[PDB]
Amino acid sequence: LDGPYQPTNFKPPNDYWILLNPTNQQVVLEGTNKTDIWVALLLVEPNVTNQSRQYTLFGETKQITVENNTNKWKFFEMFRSNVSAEFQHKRTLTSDTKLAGFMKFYNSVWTFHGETPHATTDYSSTSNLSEVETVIHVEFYIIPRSQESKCSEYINTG
Amino acid sequence: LDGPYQPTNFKPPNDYWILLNPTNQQVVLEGTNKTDIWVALLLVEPNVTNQSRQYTLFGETKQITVENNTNKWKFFEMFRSNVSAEFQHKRTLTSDTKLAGFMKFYNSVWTFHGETPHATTDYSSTSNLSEVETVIHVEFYIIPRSQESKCSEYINTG
Amino acid sequence: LDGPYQPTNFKPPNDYWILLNPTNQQVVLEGTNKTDIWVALLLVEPNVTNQSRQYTLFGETKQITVENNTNKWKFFEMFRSNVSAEFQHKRTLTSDTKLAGFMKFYNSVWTFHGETPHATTDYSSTSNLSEVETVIHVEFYIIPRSQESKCSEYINTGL
Amino acid sequence: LDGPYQPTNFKPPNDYWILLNPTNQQVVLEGTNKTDIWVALLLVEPNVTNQSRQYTLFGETKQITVENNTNKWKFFEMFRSNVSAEFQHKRTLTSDTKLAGFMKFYNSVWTFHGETPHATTDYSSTSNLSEVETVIHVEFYIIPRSQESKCSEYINTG
Ligand SMILES: CC(=O)N[C@H]1[C@H](O[C@H]2[C@@H](O)[C@@H](CO)O[C@@H](O[C@H]3[C@H](O)[C@@H](O)[C@H](O)O[C@@H]3CO)[C@@H]2O)O[C@H](CO)[C@@H](O)[C@@H]1O[C@@H]1O[C@H](CO)[C@H](O)[C@H](O)[C@H]1O[C@@H]1O[C@@H](C)[C@@H](O)[C@@H](O)[C@@H]1O
């Protein structure tokens, strides 16, 4: 656990997790290589009735549908592979820890999804992992992949 | 265990789980009241690369991007509350079992989501539950909400 | 399995079961938001002939007729929706496990009723769920709604 | 099945089930010996919001609170053992058959309670069983106690 770090932008190094530690930022992280991957993590608070909210993603103003019927926080992982496409709601991380993850590894972009305390890893695929750069809007930490079991413990139990 | 029943277009009774038992149908279920709820369950088999597939939802042809990196099956739950809107990927049921659920209950439509064996129920809201009808493209079973534990057990372990 | 917790007076979190484990307490649980829901669980031991017993519910003394013809324990679920109304005997849980359940979920209070090992949930509606507070007179456990099928298993077949 | 019989006021014989077959009556049965047994079965249709309803029981105007969250019918068993006492809601039969039972046997008045198809018998005891008389508001059948397993089948499955 290296940190905490203040909000910044950088190409996270390969084989390390970024552990994201929002307070109430709407947009937690923007990641793109400007070719074939745009990923954004949106934070929806508990007890949100189905509505359209405005988010600024990669400088573009977007209306995205959100709902949270639970007493947990939901990270909406929004994804597109074309600069011109609309975002898809690809994954959800449902959390009473309010921690999320981002990693560049094995030509993939890895996140956590599902509901704490059983949240697990999945990925999106790229031909251009080296060019993936993240704007991180929250305090964060850096955990090596050799220590993912601790990262998964912090995501699931805090 | 009540069934199996053949695929049909019908109004499911309130307070019963429809336990859906597909082989490899693309579109498992289409539910709508034609006013404020459209829900479709799409079945995505293991080891699908990011790709746009065609699905006919309520007589509308849709090009929907899907991905499954896993050796499990995924039910993509597509949702909208307006006839003129595009479908959003609301939820995912990642399944060892290839079973999914649908129930009209207590003013809401209920489905399962998450990853087996930890799939859980959540709802979508409507002011018009009584007119919600389903096209079911798969063989199904009917479980009373009273036996919701048995339905969770089938969803989670087969 | 989260607990045991000691008897207490607190505001149970939404979307968790409280699993109530009495010995011989008369009043197991008293839940109210002081506006539109009062729920009390009374515990009537096996082989009780028709009789009036005294209970203190929400600091008021009540005379409630009870009976239990069985070798199982009965949780009498007493209810009202008005501070000015009398309690009615709304539900019964007939139990070999001596376990009962309470949950705040989906704008409702949820309890178990019927007879082990086939007890099922039902609900009481409220305009103000989050103000429901509970005096719990017994040892208890906490089970997330995500694990309700475990809670149902415990209710029906025991700890 | 001995019947059908039309609604009537009579003294049922001991060791016979009266199988009650309501349509839409508020009050199914009023039984008393005018000494230590008063029992009324009220019928409450599906999807009834907590409300105060009016019933005439043994000539008395009563306001009783009822609720039925379910899509089954509920028989509210109302009891007292003194003519000047309030009724208590002693038992419920939650039913998709709409069949209920009444029997004078041994030292007791018997009814069904619980939820179909798991409905079971229970009793109220009396020192005056032979003077128990019933106003039956509904079509009914008579079944000997020797055939109670058929009575339980009918109550539970139709
Ligand atoms: C256990 C049993 O047989 N219960 C049935 C009940 O039997 C009553 C009679 O045996 C009666 C003597 O003739 O004794 C009653 O016991 C009490 C008195 O009521 C009480 O006043 C007194 O103070 O103490 C005595 C103790 O002797 C018994 O309760 O009769 C019921 C009325 O017909 C009948 O419904 C009940 O049958 C059982 O009920 C449950 C729920 O409905 C299940 O179906 C059981 O399977 C069922 O038992 C089965 O049927 C009966 C006829 C009998 O053959 C059982 O062996 C059989 O399993």
Numbering used by the authors:
A (entry chain D), B (entry chain C), D (entry chain B): 2 to 159
C (entry chain A): 2 to 160
Lines quoted from the article behind this entry:
The RV VP8* domain adopts a classical galectin-like fold with the central structure being an anti-parallel β-sandwich formed by a five-stranded β-sheet and a six-stranded β-sheet.
The crystal structures of P (strain BM11596) and P (strain BM11596) in complex with LNFP I were solved. The specific interactions between LNFP I and P VP8* were revealed by the crystal structure. The Gal-IV moiety was stabilized by F168, Y170, and W174 through hydrophobic interactions and the terminal Glc-V moiety was stabilized by Y170, S172, Y187 though hydrophobic interactions and N171 through hydrogen bonding. The Fuc-I pointed away from the protein surface, consistent with the STD NMR results. These highly conserved key residues in the P[II] genogroup are consistent with the crystal structures showing that P /P /P /P in the P[II] genotype can bind the Lewis negative type 1 HBGAs in the βα site. From the recent X-ray crystallography studies, it was found that P, P, P, P employed the βα binding site to accommodate H type 1 ligand LNFP I, which is consistent with our NMR-driven HADDOCK results.
